[PDB]
Design a protein around this nucleic acid. Structure first.
Lengths: 169, 222, 57, 184, 50, 158, 122
RNA sequence: CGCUCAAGCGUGUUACCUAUACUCCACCGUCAGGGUUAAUAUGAUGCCCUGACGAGUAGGCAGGCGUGGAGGUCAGUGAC
RNA sequence: GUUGCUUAAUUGAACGUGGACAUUUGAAUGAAGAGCUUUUAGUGGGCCAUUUUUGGUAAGCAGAACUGGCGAUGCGGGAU
RNA sequence: AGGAUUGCGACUUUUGUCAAGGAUGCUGGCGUAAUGGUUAAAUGCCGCCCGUCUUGAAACACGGACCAAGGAGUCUAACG
């Protein structure tokens, strides 16, 4: 998981020099996958392909403040067995790359949606506790939050034990 | 019988002249590679200041590796593998990149993994697993007297001079590459970094174009 | 009851031995050519034999 | 392993003679030594011809030797045959010559030595000329043999059919003329 | 017995006579470089960050 | 029973054309044919004499003989595991000149000019044909050409 | 320093179903079958003789001594092995009489030639 | 067999097990390419060097093991 | 230059005599040597898989197309 | 593995030295059933009954209770 920038162009053909340039914020494991997914989404917009064009720039976009908790709001299009549906989930994560990673896990768990059948439309960091709609996120945005962790368990590297252990905490 | 004893003193003196010629040429080729890397890195910084994007030159050389074994291979891709000298599983070559040679790689892309090497992986392959084709017969490249005897007509008077032609892609790449016997590589020490080997690099598997990550895969196999 | 026809292992048999080109030669076979042309062509080659014989002297 | 060509393939050439003759194998050893050593193309040709069979070594008539002497600038060359040299009674003026061969007939011995020639054998030739200097190799006609006419018979090849005897009432009527069905 | 240039060193020095001069001066390190300018940008950080 | 005639399965091949029926233009007859020229074959539905068999539609061959209304063309065809020589006799209406050899003669004259010209000046010719090489490095100007930020659209019902 | 002998496969190649049926002897014979598993090589079955099991050319026809054995029937047959004691050992035949063994064994021990048998009945 | 915040279902990230496959070395055979009695004891059919390859029914060719008689030869073995 | 062909012809068409131009043998890649001849064995019941596909409700049914397998083939995995 | 020397080199002020065209050095115990060989049983894993016709056999397909000797591409007239 990184958060690449892919600036394409199209070829400098005779008659029309200087093409318009096009930018996208692609998520991918490495540099080779980022260029593949660029041409995929560009092919659903303009008359271009890998033969008729070229990549100008490839830049990694690191997080500004990666040691701070943020409330993201992600829009998604995904394809089910029957058809295709639109959605709007909300995530409480430390980075954009971390938030998008956890979304692909949640879509695969509930809806059985794989990597190939998920279009990330737009990711937005929200400002105020009010814009957030979902209750499962709003639990953790309250005044003076405290809770215990009942039923702790140990993990012995050894097999046998001579105490009859407790679950106190 | 007599005077051949005196030739022992003579013949050694002429090889002392050749070692000086190798040393000065190796110093010159070191100055070419260091200036090549610095010129590209600074050229990006030149363009970035003037609100412009430097696009790098496309790869002039590519290295291929046979992934799939033998049998159950259709006749058209089997013929192309025969031309690129990848008859056995795990085999190297080097290919001079053109439009024509790129179409051959499209036909055989499920059965091979390939990418752009550097002056480091190429240096290890020619020393550790380097072998020359000398009147048929897979003969090793132990001494540089062997390379001068065969490839003395196109320059190439050393092992590093042969490496220079492969990396830079000179006028005698076709002769110099064909001289080398295909590199019989071992299986990778760490692994393939996958559960399954036949799915294409970008989806999950191993085959197809990987650009920068071929250097890591070869050094484990080397 | 019996199988009629097939073309399986047929092209595979052919490529074992060869699939070859038809050789080609300088001075091809002059057959199926116009008869009026050939009669005059014979007299031309007879006359030019006299010419080269007289030169070598 | 993708085997392009066939594996453990034979050379497809006679390495040594199939004959078990003692005196012939002595002659092979002499020329086999020279072919490795000398680096003269002449010696490698004669090494091949000593290995050949009876069909591949046809007889050279003495009239065939006389024709090669009429070549423009080849009067005194030592003509080296590799086979037998038979006598011919279709010629008269046989010139003063030098010949080298494995065998000579009783008639051909008289015809050469009457004019004042030199009937030499290949070992005696090797003493004079190791490299083969001022020589002229001659080979008899292969494809005038009685078996050669029958090879590759069919429509419409123009070859001879394999039969015992002889004229009419024997492979003439149906399939060889338009009156009786067709002309092949 | 084919040795290996990477190990052994005498077989390395049989090839590449430059291996003395490479190893002595430490070219797999080379200080190297440079001020004058840590030399900056213009409008690249707006498109990159956005 | 099975059908294996001379003009079997020739519904669309010897069909004439759309808006090109009737007579032929006179340039077809005016063209010259010497012994040596390469020629492609096209059957013409209107002309029934000297008509080729369906196999030789689109084939190419060299001319060996010439006569009043026709030209002899040898064509090599594949059968079993061995190529065979075949002799045809087609009329002028079906045959036309090939443009494959045309480009080769242009290359012969140009190379002769480059060798003769450059030897008395340049001392460097480079006359072998180069395959399409990869790119060289360059810089793209962004002045009045700023990148437009795209995004994948959501799903709609047309 | 003489090369140490390694025998590769010391176990005897028995014929298939030699122990099962009495009439089938233990002399080796190749299976020419179509249902046969010994021909096709299945896991957990008897091995077959193959050229890969052949011994080293340095030490072929040599026993534990490092000597190639020669059969001798009389005293005149000992004269090839006079100056070849380290390389060639002897062995006296079964058909030779009791008193003639003493004749051969006497002159054999003079020249220092090792006999495999003898021993010598006693 | 038994398994229930799994030893189940979807997805990710590492380690680890392992084929007669791949790399390297020993030995066997087959095939090719060389070098050599220039007196120089013992097999020129010799004596060495270098490189590749090895599944297989029907089928074809090659090199060997044994049985009964015939010609030669070890002045072969044997009532001890 | 050549002729009995062809031209109103001193034209044309075939096959030539002498002459000029070899780094740059005028795309890529490979080449395990290339081309050719004679002779004779077994075989002429086939079957399964991925796509293309006709009959049929459908079939471990019948019948074609293109490559790959089994038959002739073990070895690791799919419990078998 | 190999079994006189020959080559490429390195370190040397020099002679020489060396990890440089495949292991040498020093020490102990025993010198025979101890190491190995065959043979029988036990233990771990693996192994269906051969021959045959067949697309396909361990087959609910055919022949085989057991052993000894005998038992099947020979010779000829024209021929390639």
């Amino acid at each position: 998981r990184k958060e690449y920038q892919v600036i394409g162009r199209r070829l400098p053909t005779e008659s029309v020099p200087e093409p318009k340039l096009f930018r996208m914020r692609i998520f991918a494991p490495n540099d080779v996958v980022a260029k593949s997914r660029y041409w995929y989404f560009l092919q659903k917009l303009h008359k271009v392909k890998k033969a008729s064009g070229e990549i100008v720039s490839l830049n990694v976009i690191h997080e500004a403040h990666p040691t701070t908790v943020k409330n993201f709001g992600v829009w998604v299009r995904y394809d089910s067995r029957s058809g295709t549906h639109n959605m709007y989930k909300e995530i409480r994560d430390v980075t954009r790359v971390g938030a998008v990673e956890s979304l692909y896990q949640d879509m695969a768990a509930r809806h059985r949606a794989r990597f190939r059948s998920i279009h990330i439309l737009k990711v937005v960091e929200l400002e105020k506790t009010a814009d957030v709609k979902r209750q499962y996120v709003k639990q953790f945005l309250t005044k003076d939050l405290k809770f215990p962790l009942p039923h702790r368990v140990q993990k012995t590297n050894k097999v046998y034990a001579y105490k009859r252990p407790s679950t106190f905490y | 019988q007599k005077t051949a004893e005196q030739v022992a003193a003579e013949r050694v003196a002429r090889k002392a002249e050749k070692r000086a010629a190798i040393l000065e040429r190796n110093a010159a080729y070191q100055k070419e590679y260091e200036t090549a890397e610095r010129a590209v890195i600074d050229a990006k910084r030149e363009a970035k200041a003037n609100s412009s994007y430097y696009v790098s030159a496309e790869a002039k050389l590519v290295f291929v590796v046979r992934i799939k074994g033998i049998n159950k291979i259709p006749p058209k891709p089997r013929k192309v593998l025969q031309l690129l000298r990848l008859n056995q599983i795990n085999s190297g070559t080097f290919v001079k990149v053109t439009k024509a040679t790129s179409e051959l790689l499209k036909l055989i892309e499920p059965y091979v993994a390939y990418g752009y090497p550097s002056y480091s992986t190429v240096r290890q392959l020619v020393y550790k697993r380097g072998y020359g084709k000398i009147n048929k017969q897979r003969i090793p490249l132990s001494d540089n007297s062997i390379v001068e005897a065969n490839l003395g007509n196109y320059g190439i008077l050393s092992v590093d001079d042969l490496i220079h032609e492969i990396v830079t892609v000179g006028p005698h790449f076709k002769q110099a590459n064909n001289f080398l016997w295909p590199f019989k590589l071992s299986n990778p020490s760490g692994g393939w970094g996958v559960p399954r080997k036949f799915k294409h690099f970008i989806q999950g598997g191993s085959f197809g174009n990987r650009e920068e990550f071929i250097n890591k895969l070869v050094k484990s196999m080397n | 009851k019996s199988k009629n026809h097939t073309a399986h292992n047929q092209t595979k048999k052919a490529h074992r031995n060869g699939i070859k080109k038809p050789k080609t030669y300088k001075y091809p076979s002059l057959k199926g050519v116009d008869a009026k042309f050939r009669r005059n062509h014979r007299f031309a080659l007879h006359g030019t034999a006299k010419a080269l014989a007289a030169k070598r002297a | 392993i993708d085997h392009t060509s066939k594996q453990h393939k034979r050379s497809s050439h006679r390495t040594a003679p199939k004959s078990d003759n003692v005196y012939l194998k002595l002659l092979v050893k002499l020329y086999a030594f020279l072919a490795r050593r000398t680096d003269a193309p002449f010696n490698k040709v004669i090494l091949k011809s000593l290995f050949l069979s009876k069909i591949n070594r046809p007889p050279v008539s003495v009239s065939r030797i006389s024709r090669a002497l009429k070549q423009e600038g080849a009067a005194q060359k030592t003509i080296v045959v590799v086979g037998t040299v038979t006598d011919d009674n279709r010629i008269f003026e046989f010139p003063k010559t030098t010949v080298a061969a494995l065998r000579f007939t009783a008639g051909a011995k008289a015809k050469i030595l009457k004019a004042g020639g030199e009937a030499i054998t290949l070992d005696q030739l090797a003493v004079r000329a190791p490299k083969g200097q001022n020589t002229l190799i001659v080979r008899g006609p292969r494809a005038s043999r009685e078996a050669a006419r029958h090879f590759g018979f069919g429509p419409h090849k123009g070859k001879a059919p394999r039969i015992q005897s002889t004229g009419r009432k024997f492979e003439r009527a149906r399939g060889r003329r338009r009156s009786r069905a067709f002309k092949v | 017995q084919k040795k290996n240039p990477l190990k052994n060193k005498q077989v390395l020095l049989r090839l590449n006579p430059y291996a003395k001069v490479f190893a002595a001066e430490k070219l797999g390190s080379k200080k190297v470089d440079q001020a004058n300018k840590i030399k900056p940008s213009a409008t690249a950080l707006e498109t990159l960050k956005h | 029973g099975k059908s294996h005639g001379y003009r079997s399965r020739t519904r669309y091949m010897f069909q004439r054309d759309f808006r090109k029926h009737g007579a032929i233009a006179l340039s077809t007859y005016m063209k010259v044919y010497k012994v040596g020229d390469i020629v492609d074959i096209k059957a013409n539905g209107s002309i029934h004499k000297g008509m080729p068999h369906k196999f030789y539609q689109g084939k190419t061959g060299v001319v060996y003989n010439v006569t009043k209304s026709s030209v002899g063309i040898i064509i090599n065809k594949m059968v079993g595991n061995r190529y065979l020589e075949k002799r045809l006799n087609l009329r002028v209406e079906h045959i036309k000149h090939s443009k494959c050899r045309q480009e080769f003669l242009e290359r012969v004259k140009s190379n002769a000019a480059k060798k003769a010209e450059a030897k008395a000046q340049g001392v460097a010719v480079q006359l072998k044909r180069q395959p399409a090489q990869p790119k060289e490095s360059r810089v793209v100007s962004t002045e009045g050409n700023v990148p437009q930020t795209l995004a994948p659209v959501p799903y709609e019902t047309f | 320093l003489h090369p140490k002998i390694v025998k590769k496969h010391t176990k005897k190649f028995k014929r298939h179903h030699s122990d099962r049926y009495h009439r089938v002897s233990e002399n080796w014979r190749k299976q020419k079958g179509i249902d046969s598993v010994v021909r096709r090589r299945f896991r957990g079955n008897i091995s077959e003789p193959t050229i890969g099991y052949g011994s080293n050319k340095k030490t072929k026809f040599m026993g534990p001594d490092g000597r190639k054995v020669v059969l001798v029937s009389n005293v005149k047959g000992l004269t090839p092995l006079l100056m070849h004691t380290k390389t060639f050992a002897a062995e006296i035949a079964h058909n030779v009489s009791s008193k003639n063994r003493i004749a051969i064994l006497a002159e054999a021990k003079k020249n220092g030639i090792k006999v495999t048998n003898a021993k010598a009945r006693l």
